[PDB]
Design a protein around this ligand. Structure first.
Ligand code: MG
Ligand code: MG
Ligand code: MG
Ligand code: MG
Ligand code: MG
Ligand code: MG
Ligand code: MG
Ligand code: MG
Ligand code: MG
Ligand code: MG
Ligand code: MG
Ligand code: MG
Ligand code: MG
Ligand code: MG
Ligand code: MG
Ligand code: MG
Ligand code: MG
Ligand code: MG
Ligand code: MG
Ligand code: MG
Ligand code: MG
Ligand code: MG
Ligand code: MG
Ligand code: MG
Ligand code: MG
Ligand code: MG
Ligand code: MG
Ligand code: MG
Ligand code: MG
Ligand code: MG
Ligand code: MG
Ligand code: MG
Ligand code: MG
Ligand code: MG
Ligand code: MG
Ligand code: MG
Ligand code: MG
Lengths: 244, 240, 77, 75, 98, 122
RNA sequence: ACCAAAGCUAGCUCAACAUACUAAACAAAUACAAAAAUACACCAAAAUAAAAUAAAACAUUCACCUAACAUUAAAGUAUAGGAGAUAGAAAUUUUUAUCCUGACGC
RNA sequence: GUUUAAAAGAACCAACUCAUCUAUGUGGCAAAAUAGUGAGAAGACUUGUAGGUAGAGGUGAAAAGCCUAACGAGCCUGGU
RNA sequence: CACGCUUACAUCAGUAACUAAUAAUAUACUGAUAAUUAACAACCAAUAAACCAAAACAACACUAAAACGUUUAUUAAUUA
RNA sequence: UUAAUUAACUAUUCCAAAAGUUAAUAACUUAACAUGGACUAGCAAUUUCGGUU
């Protein structure tokens, strides 16, 4: 026998059925789309066509992303969207020589980054590319709010983004209870990323966390049948009272 | 399975505690050091290597203790000595001529005049004469006597310059430390320990030394009389 | 000096708290609702359990100073 | 509660009476209600085995019906 | 950051399909290491009067080390973004007239 | 080799393997090593008085049976609370906030025999 | 004449459709040494596929090899290859709804 | 048990532990045994229970020994 | 007795054939019915303090430095 | 192994990265980790042993 639905669509079917269907539509549509992350380790070519130097003919070239491995320690820091490059290499850079497995690893650094919206200094394991992206975005909070999930590749970064988005959507007075002017000045410069509360609490959540949150939201105690029967009897009595 | 260490005892006690030997096996269970295992059952007598340790912090001055008994210790090659002062007793490493019913001084005071060095006495290096034989010397003030402890071994004080004392270890190497490091004077007990003669191959098994491997290995370049110069003086002073 | 406790035998320190507990104004999503550990969710922090009714055998030993016969002066018995 | 044990199956775990909460019980804490990433293949294998069993049972029933119709031509 | 390139050519896939990879496509050559290239300089706008660089209200090009460990954490300077530069422009315009 | 299909009971092990046969515990271990049995843990059989009880284990063979009507929650409600609530609503003193007079229980933790926790065996 | 011999069924196999995919039983006990009601915790982990084989040897290479894009052509073409064995696209094209499902299968 | 101021990796010799030599056995009682005869027998001794070290390894008083009756590197499954 | 096997144990009855490497019959096959009754054994307190001083008839010693414990203070459901 | 290609890991050393320090663009240091590229050795990995006689 054969399966009616291919194995590649089984996860999609489970996401469509069950409690996964009751999840918010904006979260679902954010999870479905798989955007190609920015090239970090492989250098892409600009144009889509290229002239072969040997064939002297135009051919369509494409970019294939190089698989990069993210160890579980990367989810606790901000490595800038990079990780471990596991692959092979030719010793002495000769094809006809030996093939050798090689693991290229990034240079991690324990740096302390200060956030303006959350007002806390986090001791995070960041990379030089992370610091460069921060300097390019002209701010830690700017970098967090601008780089998406596919470019962060960090659960901690997604949690930071969710926290600052919730703070911006709630206008939290706990930022600076003694400096309302400073709080307002901080909240104004991040106005371009203001997201409503209905979507600000579902951005840095995984599938398991989202299912757990939906279960905690839908967790209702079973009402006793006494209440339902009393309501039915009251309805019947009101009907018999109005039908006379 | 991973084994736990027997050294789980935070409270210092004078009574001997039972210890679980392990023959070359690390906490994993594989041999790390060959030729170890199957010795005699031994207890552990906890030694207090920080000699200058007052009972209460209210009186941090020097103190005198009395030697009760010089006993044998199966864990080290030296002899241990029970010393009592105040309300507590402690095991220390007995010197060459330390007998029962002696008085030992433990001081941390340095003065312009050198003190007369007895055996059981323990003064900082800055207070001892320039040619004094010492043992149980320290690296940092208050760290504890990691250095000379073996039976009969003793170092010698060479000179004191710029509030820093230079000593010479039994390995004929020079060690520079601060002058406030406490050190015990004299030679360690059991000076005839090197002259002992293992009578038979069974005494090694009693001590807990398994026989060497029977594999014949050809000598490499490492073998031969390597006449190397004396290494430079090991300094422990942190110069800013 | 020389501390008499070995780290591998002492009570190991609690694991570091999850990174979601350092974000101000953010509720952690833990596994406390399912009454069991589940990977991917945060570690819930629980307050010290209060057995509203005391049990003689299964209670913590009261301290020495709580005893009514406790005195400041040390007696040598 | 409807739990998922280490074997990937969905079970109905009944609750027991305990004098201490769930986060303080040693015997209960070393239990696992979740499946590791290596149990998905076994779950799919169970699914395929049950599918094959049902398919061959349906084919057997069809063959029996056809045999009976051919043996009794009362139509 | 290490930059690697495949030794072997990957066949095409034009319908948006994922490229069919092989074991031979895991062989990489290290074509560049960004950590070894001469690093660029960070431009920062002073918010206070420091002794070495100069008076508050100027753009200076300092190395990323000092720009990240001294000027930015201590609030001694800010980035050179347009939104942060308009403020200093209007401050200079208010200062020159008075 | 040993057997795997047979049940693993207490008779098949060493002296230090003493597994119970399914009985419930009746106490704990005291001070001197003995067993202290708690009289609250032992089941108290509540036996009624069968002296003047005119009912036998069997019924008359000529007695007729009845159609199977499994008792339901709606039927029980109609039998115990529908007349009372109907009379109360006809009299006009119906209180939707207080339903304890009709037999409803807000919280089970007050009474002795609760229904959801099932504090009683039988 | 013994030993023996012959049944036609239990059922299987390959497909189509298909609800959409870990069956039924789960009173109590079941990850204490499973099926043992009952005490102050610890819980969790990832780091490339390899080789047998072909190149009549074997070192670079060796389709499939438990990762969806299917079909008709382009096309075994451009290309990639100790330029050897072999590997191998794409741009661009075609694909009319349902029943008619059973068996030159045992 | 005996000899010894001796519990001396001493001596004689039991239980016990090994297995020197011979004869049977060789699809045998036995996939290593029987009988006689031997060596140690207070020690580097035998032995009960429970745990650990796992194969690109472990362990080894090196016999390239032993790691569940075939180990110059176990067995099972898959590649096949 | 411990470890291990689980009824192969006990009574009655039958054995033409099945098990005993053959019979007689039966602890080893078959069927029915019964049985092993706790005093022995298993499960059967923590938290701090005083505690250096071997077991070998242990008087006292040797070296290889040696398992085996009480008392005091606070809490230990209390009921065949 | 004095065979041919050379990995991972462990010990050296060097350069780069990172942290910094001095003076009116230069010089200098690295506690624990630790990334990239080279060097010398251990531990080692893959494969082979032309044919007529
Ligand atoms: Mg020793
Ligand atoms: Mg000694
Ligand atoms: Mg030797
Ligand atoms: Mg030798
Ligand atoms: Mg078996
Ligand atoms: Mg038993
Ligand atoms: Mg038994
Ligand atoms: Mg009793
Ligand atoms: Mg070949
Ligand atoms: Mg061939
Ligand atoms: Mg060959
Ligand atoms: Mg071959
Ligand atoms: Mg292959
Ligand atoms: Mg070429
Ligand atoms: Mg060729
Ligand atoms: Mg195409
Ligand atoms: Mg002898
Ligand atoms: Mg014999
Ligand atoms: Mg004879
Ligand atoms: Mg004999
Ligand atoms: Mg003899
Ligand atoms: Mg002899
Ligand atoms: Mg074991
Ligand atoms: Mg090999
Ligand atoms: Mg080996
Ligand atoms: Mg040899
Ligand atoms: Mg040989
Ligand atoms: Mg074998
Ligand atoms: Mg048996
Ligand atoms: Mg017979
Ligand atoms: Mg019988
Ligand atoms: Mg060579
Ligand atoms: Mg190869
Ligand atoms: Mg070889
Ligand atoms: Mg040849
Ligand atoms: Mg030849
Ligand atoms: Mg010839």
């Amino acid at each position: 026998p054969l399966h009616k639905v291919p194995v590649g669509l089984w996860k999609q079917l489970r996401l469509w059925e069950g409690i996964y269907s009751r999840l918010p539509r904006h979260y679902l549509r954010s999870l479905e789309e798989a955007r190609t992350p920015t090239p970090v380790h492989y250098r892409p070519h600009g144009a889509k066509f290229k002239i072969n130097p040997k064939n002297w003919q135009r051919e369509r070239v494409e970019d294939v992303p190089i698989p990069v491995h993210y160890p579980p320690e990367s989810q606790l820091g901000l490595w800038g969207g990079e990780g471990w490059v596991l692959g092979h290499r030719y010793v002495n850079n000769d094809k006809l020589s030996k093939r050798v497995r090689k693991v290229w690893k990034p240079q991690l650094f324990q740096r302390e980054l200060y956030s303006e919206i959350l007002d806390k200094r986090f001791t995070v394991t960041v990379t030089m590319r992370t610091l460069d992206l921060i300097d390019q975005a002209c701010g830690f909070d700017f970098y967090i709010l601008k780089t998406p999930k596919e470019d962060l590749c960090s659960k901690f970064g997604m949690d930071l983004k969710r926290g600052m988005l919730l703070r911006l959507a709630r206008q939290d007075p706990q930022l600076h209870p003694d400096d309302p002017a400073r709080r307002a000045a901080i909240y104004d410069r991040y106005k371009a990323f203001v997201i409503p509360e209905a979507e600000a609490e579902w951005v840095g959540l995984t599938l398991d966390e989202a299912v757990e949150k939906q279960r905690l939201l839908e967790e209702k105690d079973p009402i006793p049948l006494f209440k339902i029967f009393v309501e039915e009897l009251l309805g019947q009595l009101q009907q018999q009272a109005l039908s006379e | 399975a991973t084994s736990v260490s027997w050294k789980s005892r935070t409270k210092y006690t004078v009574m001997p505690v039972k210890m679980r030997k392990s023959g070359g096996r690390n906490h994993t269970g594989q041999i790390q050091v060959h030729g170890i295992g199957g010795g005699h059952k031994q207890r552990y007598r906890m030694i207090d290597f920080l000699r200058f340790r007052p009972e209460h912090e209210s009186k941090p001055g020097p103190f005198e203790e009395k030697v009760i008994a010089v006993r044998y210790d199966p864990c080290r090659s030296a002899d241990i000595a029970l010393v009592a002062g105040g309300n507590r007793k402690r095991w220390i490493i007995a010197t060459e001529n330390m007998k029962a019913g002696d008085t030992v001084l433990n001081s941390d005071h340095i003065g312009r005049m050198a003190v007369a060095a007895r055996e059981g006495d323990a003064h900082p290096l800055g207070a001892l004469p320039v040619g004094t034989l010492i043992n149980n010397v320290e690296s940092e003030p208050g760290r504890g006597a990691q250095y000379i402890r073996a039976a009969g071994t003793c170092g010698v004080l060479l000179r004191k310059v710029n509030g820093t004392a230079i000593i010479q270890l039994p390995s004929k190497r020079q060690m520079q430390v601060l002058e406030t490091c406490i050190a015990t004077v004299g030679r360690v007990s059991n000076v005839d320990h090197n002259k002992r003669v293992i009578g038979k191959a069974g005494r090694n098994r009693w001590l807990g030394k398994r026989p060497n491997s029977g594999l014949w290995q050809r000598k490499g370049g490492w073998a031969g009389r390597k006449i190397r110069p004396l290494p430079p003086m090991k300094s422990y002073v942190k110069l800013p | 000096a020389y501390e008499w406790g070995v780290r591998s035998t002492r009570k190991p320190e609690p694991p570091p708290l999850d990174r979601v507990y350092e974000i101000p104004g953010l509720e952690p999503i833990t596994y406390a609702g399912k009454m069991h550990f589940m990977p991917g969710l945060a570690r819930p922090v629980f307050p010290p359990w209060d057995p509203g009714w005391t049990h003689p055998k299964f209670r913590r030993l009261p301290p020495l100073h709580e005893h009514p016969l406790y005195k400041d002066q040390a007696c040598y018995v | 509660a409807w739990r998922r044990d280490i074997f990937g199956r969905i079970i109905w775990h009944k609750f027991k009476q305990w004098p201490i909460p769930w986060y303080l019980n040693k015997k209960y804490n070393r239990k696992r209600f979740f499946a590791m990433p290596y149990v998905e293949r076994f779950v799919r294998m169970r699914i395929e085995k049950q599918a094959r069993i049902k398919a061959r049972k349906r084919s057997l029933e069809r063959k029996k019906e056809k045999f009976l119709q051919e043996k009794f031509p009362h139509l | 950051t290490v930059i690697v390139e495949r030794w072997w050519k990957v066949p095409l896939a034009g319908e948006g399909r994922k490229p069919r990879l092989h074991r031979r496509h895991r062989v990489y050559k290290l074509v560049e290491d960004t950590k070894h290239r001469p690093k660029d300089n960070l431009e920062l706008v002073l918010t206070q009067s420091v002794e070495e660089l100069g008076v508050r209200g100027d753009l200076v090009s300092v190395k990323k080390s000092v720009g990240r460990n001294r000027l930015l954490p201590q609030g001694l300077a800010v980035y050179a973004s347009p939104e942060n530069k308009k403020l200093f422009e209007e401050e200079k315009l208010l200062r020159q007239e008075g | 080799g040993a057997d795997r299909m047979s049940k693993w009971t207490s008779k098949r092990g060493p002296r230090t393997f003493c597994k119970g046969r399914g009985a419930k515990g009746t106490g704990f271990h005291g001070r001197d090593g003995k067993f202290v049995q708690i009289k609250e843990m032992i089941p108290e059989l509540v036996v009624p008085e069968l002296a003047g009880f005119k009912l036998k284990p069997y019924v008359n063979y000529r007695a007729p049976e009845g159609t199977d009507t499994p008792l339901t929650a709606k039927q029980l409600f109609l039998e115990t609370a529908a007349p009372a609530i109907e009379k109360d609503f006809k009299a006009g003193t119906f209180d939707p906030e207080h339903l304890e007079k009709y037999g409803f229980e807000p919280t089970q933790e007050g009474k002795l025999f609760q229904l959801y926790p099932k504090n009683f065996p039988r």
